[PDB]
Design a protein around this ligand. Structure first.
Ligand SMILES: O=C[C@H](O)[C@@H](O)[C@@H](O)CO
Ligand SMILES: O=C[C@H](O)[C@@H](O)[C@@H](O)CO
Ligand SMILES: O=C[C@H](O)[C@@H](O)[C@@H](O)CO
Ligand SMILES: O=C[C@H](O)[C@@H](O)[C@@H](O)CO
Ligand code: NI
Ligand code: NI
Ligand code: NI
Ligand code: NI
Ligand code: NI
Ligand code: NI
Ligand code: NI
Ligand code: NI
Ligand code: NI
Ligand code: NI
Ligand code: NI
Ligand code: NI
Lengths: 388, 388, 388, 388
C-alpha cells in the first residue's frame, strides 16, 4: 500500500531530465534553467539514490579550467550534503554545431579526434566522482541520405573510437565499464547501431568486449516497434545489461520521453517483472522529460511519478509470481518444459529416438491448447489489482 | 538499355513465391497450385539461375518414403533439363498446427525434438541437391503475451537447437552453412531475433559461430522502420552476409512481399549500390508474392519485374559511382576522410596532440557545410536518368 | 469487486470471433469449425447480450434457398432458446476470389452490381432478425499499386453504392442505419476511407447523410498510430457513433484483434471513460480473434476476458471521475474553462476587448503550469487501484 | 531534358524553410538567421514564383507598430523589386510559451481570445499583401495525456474559433479562404484533426463550410503511414484542395521535412501524376527544412532540388499517361470500367437484373486477372526512364 521510495531502491535521474527547459522543434523554453545543486537537493528529498550527467550539463561548454574547478566543487558539496551518488556519466557529443555530422563517426577526421579528447576528459571526471558506468549515446552518428555515409567505414571508425577508450581506461587502471545506448532515429534520419541487437553485435567485434555493455531505453526500442522486455531479456542472456534508461513512449513517432509508467503500461509491467526476477542490481535510471506544459511543481510531480509507478508495478509483478494459481497456470502452459533442455541426451540419442519423429503423433501434440489466454488474464487481474 | 537477365546474374526464386496461391487472412486462394516442375521450367525461360525450397513445398507433408523419392526424382529431372541450380534450402517449421507455439522454442519439449528431426532430414536432402546455404526463419518462435514465453529460456533452447545442427553438419562432413532470417513480427505478436542486429548478436554465442550468418529480407527490416542498406552494411562488416531476400515493402504494416523495386525505391537503389560495390557474390534471391489480384500471366510478369528492376538499379548505381562529378562531390563531403583512421598515430600521440583539443578551432570546423544535399541530388538525377 | 457480466451490459460478439479457426497467412487452422448454434449457447452462458454475423458466417456461400431457410431456422431457434439478440449484421464482400479487387469499387462493373445484390439480400435478412445497424467494412476496396485504382472514380462508385442502399432501405420502409467501418490497410496495401476521419468526411457527401454513421475498431485506428479515444470523441461530436468494435492491438503492425484490454491498456481506460461519460447506449461489440495457440477452453476464456476487462475499466473510470481530489485537479488544469465559450460576447466585443490583446500579459499567462502530470498520475493510481 | 523552373510553374516557399537555422531537440543552430529580404531575392533567382510567411517570421514577436510598419515596407520593396508574389500566409500559434497548451483550444480562455486576435491581425496583413489563402496549422492543439483535454469541448472551441474567423472575413468583405493543415503528432503527443480525413469532416460542421478547405503536407500523412496520393484524391473529390505542402519523409517517425522528391519517391510520382491530371491550379508550395549539416550553399541547392524533382516527375508522369502501351494496359486493367456508373439504370432495374445475381457466373469473373503488375512495371519503367 505504501509506495514511498528510499535510496535503497537505486532510483537515479539525469540532470538533463528534471532540468529540461521545454525547448522543442517548434517552441521556446517554458521553464528557467535549474542549478544542478538545486536539482540534487530536490531529488534527494523525493527519495532518489543518485544523479547522472553529461559533461556539458555540469560545466558550461567553453569553461576555463578555473570555472570548471568551481562548478565541480559546488556539485561535490551538494553530493556530500545529501548523500547522493553519481553512478553513471556520459558525454554530450550532440549539441554543439561541430557535431552536426557526428562525433566518433563524423566525416571530418579532426572532429573525430576532438570527440575522443572531449570524452576522455570527462571519463577522468566520472572516475573522480565515483561513476561505475560510462554511457555513450551516438545521437549524431548516422545520416539523412544514402551517399553521405559509408556505413562500413563508419563502423570501422566507431570501433576505433571505442577500442581507444578501452585502451585508455585499461592503461589508467580505472574500474569503469562502458554502455552503448542505441536509438533508431532522431535527431539523424537513421542512427548507427539502431537497436539493442545491433549494439550487442558490434560489441563482439571490439578488442576488449568484456568492457562494454548496453544501456537500453524503453522508448528507443519502442520507436522501432520492438518489444522492450524481449530486448532486455536478450541483453541479460548475453550478460550485457550494464545500465538501463526508464521512461514512457506511445508507439512509433518522435521520442517523447514520458515519465516511466506512461506510454505502454503492460510493457512496463513485464519489464519490471523481468528486472526483479533476473536480479538486476544496477541503477533504475529515469531518462525522461517533464512535458513543457508543466511548471516546476509539475516537474517534481512527474519525477515522483516515475518512482511511484516502478514501485507499484514491482508489487504487482511479485504478487503475480507468488500467486499459487499463477504457478499452476505456468505449468499448464508448459513454461517449466521450456526451461528443460531439448536434447541433453545428445545428438546421436536424438537421431535414434523414434518417439521424436517416426512415431511422433503430430495430431495429438497439435491439439493441445497452450492456455496462454487464461495465463494472460491472470496477469491482467494482478496488474489491475482485481484478483478474486 | 538492355535489361535482360541471364543465369550469370545469379537470380533465384523460392518455389513458394511464384507458387503462392493467393490465400490471405481474409480470403481464399485466387490461383491454382503450381507443380514445382512447371515453376522450374517457367523460371528458367525468364532467365533465372536457380530455385529454393522449404521441405514441404517439394514433398507434401506426411508423404511416405516412396512418394518422397518420386517427388525428388521429378524435381531433379527438371533441374537437369533446364540447367537450374538449388543454392539454398530451408525447413517449413510454421504451417502445421503442431508448430503453433514454435519449432525450436516451442514450450512443449516433444515438439522441439520433432522440429530438429524434421530439419535434419531436410539438411540431408539439401546437400544431395547441391545447396550451399541452409536458411532458418523462426516464424513461430515468439509470443502474443508476456508470460507465455520466458525469453532467456527460449534463447537457451534456440542456441541448443542451432548448436546441435552445427554438430550434425560437422559430424557428417557437409559443406553447408546456416543463415538466420530475422523478422520482427507476423505471424507471432513479437518474433525472437527480430532484426539483423539481434540475429548477429545471437550468432556470437553459438559454439561454432563461423558456421552461421544472416539472411536479411528488405521488407522485414522495413517492418521495424529500419534502414535496410545500413543493416546489410553491418552484416557485411561482420562478414556474415551469407544470403539475401529481395522484395518490396511500403512502410510499417503487414509483410507485403511486393516484387523487388516496388515499395521504397530509393532504399532499393542504395541496397544495389552497396551489394555491387562490396562484391557480394551470393545469390540475388527474391522472396516475394505476386498479388492475389493477378492470374498466371501476372505472376510471371511480376517475377520478370524483380530481375528487371535489379538490373536497372545496377546500371544507375554504377553510373553514379563512375561519374567524375560524383567522385568530386564525395570528396567535397569528405567521404575520403571517413575512410582514414582517426588515430593511427596511437592513444598517447592523440593525448599529446594540442590540435585535437586545446588549440582546436571548433567554430571554424562547425561552419563547414557537409554538402550532402548536392551529393544526394546527384544520386537522385542518376536514379531517374536525368543527368546533365 | 464482482465483475460478472449480464445481458444488461450489452456485450455482443461476432460469430466469426469465437468461431475463428486459427488460419493465418503462414499456417493452417488449429481449431475445428464451430456451429453457430453452439456459439450462441456458449456466449449466452458467459453473459453476452447478443451476436452479429456476416451473411456467409450463417449461410455457407452458394447455399440453395432451401438450405438457406434451414440454416436461418436453426439459428432463430437458438436465439429463442437463449434470449440472445442480433443488433447488427454485415456482408462478407472480401473472402470469395470474385472480390479480389473489391466489392463496391471493383474495377469490373459486373462485380460491383453483384456486390450490391449480395448486400441487399442480407439487409432483408438482417431486418427479419431485428438488427438495427448494418455494418460495411470495405476490406478489399483499395490497391497495392498507384495506377490500379483512380481514387476519385472509386469514391464516385462508393457513393453510388451507398446511395443505392439508402434508397433501398427508404423504399422498403426499414428502420435500419448503416455504419462504415474504416481500416487503413490489410488485406489491401492501402484501403479506401482509411480512418474514422475519412469515413466521416465521405458520409457528408451522400444523398441521405442521416442514415450513415461509423463503426470504428480500436485496433484499426491504432494501425495508423492514431489516438482511438480522440477519434471516438470526434465521431460522438458529429453524432455519428452508431456502433463500435472493441479489441486490442500492440502498435503499428498487422491487425492482431487481441481480446479487449490487451494491447494499449491506458487507451482502453480512456475509451471506457469516454463511452460511459458520453452516455453511449449502443452495443459493446467485440471483434477479436482468440489466438491460434488456444484450444476451445482458451477461446471461451478469451471471450470472458473481453467482458471482464471492460467491467473493471468501467469501475476504475467511474471512481476516477467521482474522486473529489480528481475533480479539484480538473479545475486546477482548467478543464472547466475549456468547456466555456471563447467569445459568447461576439466578434465585435472581442475586437474591442483590450484585455484580449493590447493589454494581455502574455508572460504571466505563459508562466502558469497546466498541472497535467499530477492529474495523469491520479488517473494512473485509479487505473491500478493504488489510491491513497 | 531541361528542368529549369520559371515563375509560371507556381513554385513557392515559406520564409521559415530556407530560413531554418538548424536548431533541433538535441542541438543548437548551425546557420545564422536570414533576412527575409535576402530570401526573397535568392528565391527569385532560383525561379520561384512566390513566398509565404507566418506573422512572426516577418515581424519579430513583440514589435511595436512602428517597427512592424518598417519590416513590412522593406519586405514589400523586395517583392516589388523581384516580381515575387505572396499567395498564402499563416499565424504562428506554436512558438511562444503562452501557446504551450494550444491556441484555439488552450484550456485557458484568455489564451484562446489572444490567439484569435493575433490571427485576425495577420489576416488583415495577408489581404494587404495579396494572399488568397490563409493556412491554419494547430500544432499545439492536442495533448500528451488523456484527462488533460476533453476532445468534444476542444472541438467546440475549434469550431467557435473558425466560425468567428469566417464571420470576420465575411464582414470585412475579404476575398480569402482558409485551409486547415493536419498533422497527427509532434510537438503534441497527439494533435487534434490528425489527418486530411479528420479535417474534411470537421469542415462540414462549420457555419460557412464553403470558406474552408485543407492544406495537406506529404510528410504529415506519411507520419500516420497513410497513402498521400489517396488522401489528396479524397480532398479533390470533395472540392477542398485549396493549397498543398510538398516535402519528403522516410516513414513513420519524427517530421523530417526533407526536400521534395526525397523520402518516398514513388509516392511523389503518383502525387504529381494526380495533381497534373486533375488540373490543380494552386501553388506548388514547399514546406521543407534543409538539413542542419548544410551551409548556405547547401540550402539553396536543396531548394533548387525541390523544384527540379517536381519537374522531372511531371515529365515522367506525362510520358506515362501519353504512352499508347500504357493506355492499352489501363483498359486491360478495366480502369475505364471503374469510371462507368455501376447502376445508371436505377435500383429497380438492378433488382430485376438476373445477370447481376441469379445468373452471375462468379467463377468466371473470379478467374480474370487484373493485370495490375504489368501496369505497375510500365509505371516503374517510365519513372526510371527505362522504356523500350
Ligand atoms: O534520446 C537521447 C538519449 O537518450 C540521451 O538523453 C541520454 O540517454 C544520453 O545522452
Ligand atoms: O515471411 C516469411 C519468410 O520470409 C519466409 O517466406 C522464407 O524466407 C523462409 O521460410
Ligand atoms: O478487419 C476486419 C473487420 O474488422 C471485420 O472483421 C468486421 O468488423 C466486419 O467485416
Ligand atoms: O510541421 C509544421 C507545419 O507544417 C508548419 O511548418 C507550416 O506548414 C504552418 O505553420
Ligand atoms: Ni532517449
Ligand atoms: Ni528517448
Ligand atoms: Ni537515454
Ligand atoms: Ni518474409
Ligand atoms: Ni516477408
Ligand atoms: Ni524471406
Ligand atoms: Ni478488424
Ligand atoms: Ni481488426
Ligand atoms: Ni471490425
Ligand atoms: Ni510540417
Ligand atoms: Ni512537416
Ligand atoms: Ni506544412
Amino acid at each position: 500500500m505504501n509506495y514511498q521510495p528510499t535510496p535503497e531502491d537505486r532510483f537515479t535521474f539525469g540532470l538533463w531530465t528534471v532540468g529540461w527547459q521545454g525547448r522543442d522543434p517548434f517552441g521556446d523554453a517554458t521553464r528557467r534553467a535549474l542549478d544542478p545543486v538545486e536539482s540534487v537537493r530536490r531529488l534527494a528529498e523525493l527519495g532518489a539514490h543518485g544523479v547522472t550527467f553529461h559533461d556539458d550539463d555540469l560545466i558550461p561548454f567553453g569553461s576555463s579550467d578555473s570555472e570548471r574547478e568551481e562548478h565541480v566543487k559546488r556539485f561535490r558539496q551538494a553530493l556530500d550534503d545529501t548523500g547522493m551518488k553519481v553512478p553513471m556519466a556520459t558525454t554530450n557529443l550532440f549539441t554543439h554545431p561541430v557535431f552536426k555530422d557526428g562525433g566518433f563517426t563524423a566525416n571530418d577526421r579532426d572532429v573525430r579526434r576532438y570527440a575522443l579528447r572531449k570524452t576522455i576528459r570527462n571519463i577522468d571526471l566520472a572516475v573522480e566522482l565515483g561513476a561505475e558506468t560510462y554511457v555513450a549515446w551516438g545521437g549524431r552518428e548516422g545520416a539523412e541520405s544514402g551517399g553521405a555515409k559509408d556505413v562500413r567505414d563508419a563502423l570501422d571508425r566507431m570501433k576505433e573510437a571505442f577500442d581507444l577508450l578501452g585502451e585508455y581506461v585499461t592503461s589508467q587502471g580505472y574500474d569503469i565499464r562502458f554502455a552503448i545506448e542505441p536509438k533508431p532515429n532522431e535527431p539523424r534520419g537513421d542512427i548507427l547501431l539502431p537497436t539493442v541487437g545491433h549494439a550487442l553485435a558490434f560489441i563482439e567485434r571490439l578488442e576488449r568486449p568484456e568492457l562494454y555493455g548496453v544501456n537500453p531505453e524503453v522508448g528507443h526500442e519502442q520507436m522501432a516497434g520492438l518489444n522492450f522486455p524481449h530486448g532486455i531479456a536478450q541483453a541479460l542472456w548475453a550478460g550485457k545489461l550494464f545500465h538501463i534508461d526508464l521512461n514512457g513512449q506511445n508507439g512509433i513517432k518522435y521520442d517523447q520521453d514520458l515519465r516511466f509508467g506512461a506510454g505502454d503500461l503492460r510493457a512496463a509491467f513485464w519489464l519490471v517483472d523481468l528486472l526483479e526476477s533476473a536480479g538486476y542490481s544496477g541503477p533504475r535510471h529515469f531518462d525522461f522529460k517533464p512535458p513543457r506544459t508543466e511548471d516546476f511543481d509539475g516537474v517534481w510531480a512527474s519525477a515522483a511519478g516515475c518512482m511511484r509507478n516502478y514501485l507499484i508495478l514491482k508489487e504487482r509483478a511479485a504478487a503475480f509470481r507468488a500467486d499459487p494459481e499463477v504457478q499452476e497456470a505456468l505449468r499448464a502452459s508448459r513454461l517449466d518444459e521450456l526451461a528443460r533442455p531439448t536434447a541433453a541426451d545428445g545428438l546421436q540419442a536424438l537421431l535414434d529416438d523414434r518417439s521424436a519423429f517416426e512415431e511422433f503423433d503430430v495430431d495429438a501434440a497439435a491439439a493441445r491448447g497452450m492456455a496462454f489466454e487464461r495465463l494472460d488474464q491472470l496477469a491482467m487481474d494482478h496488474l489491475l489489482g482485481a484478483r478474486g
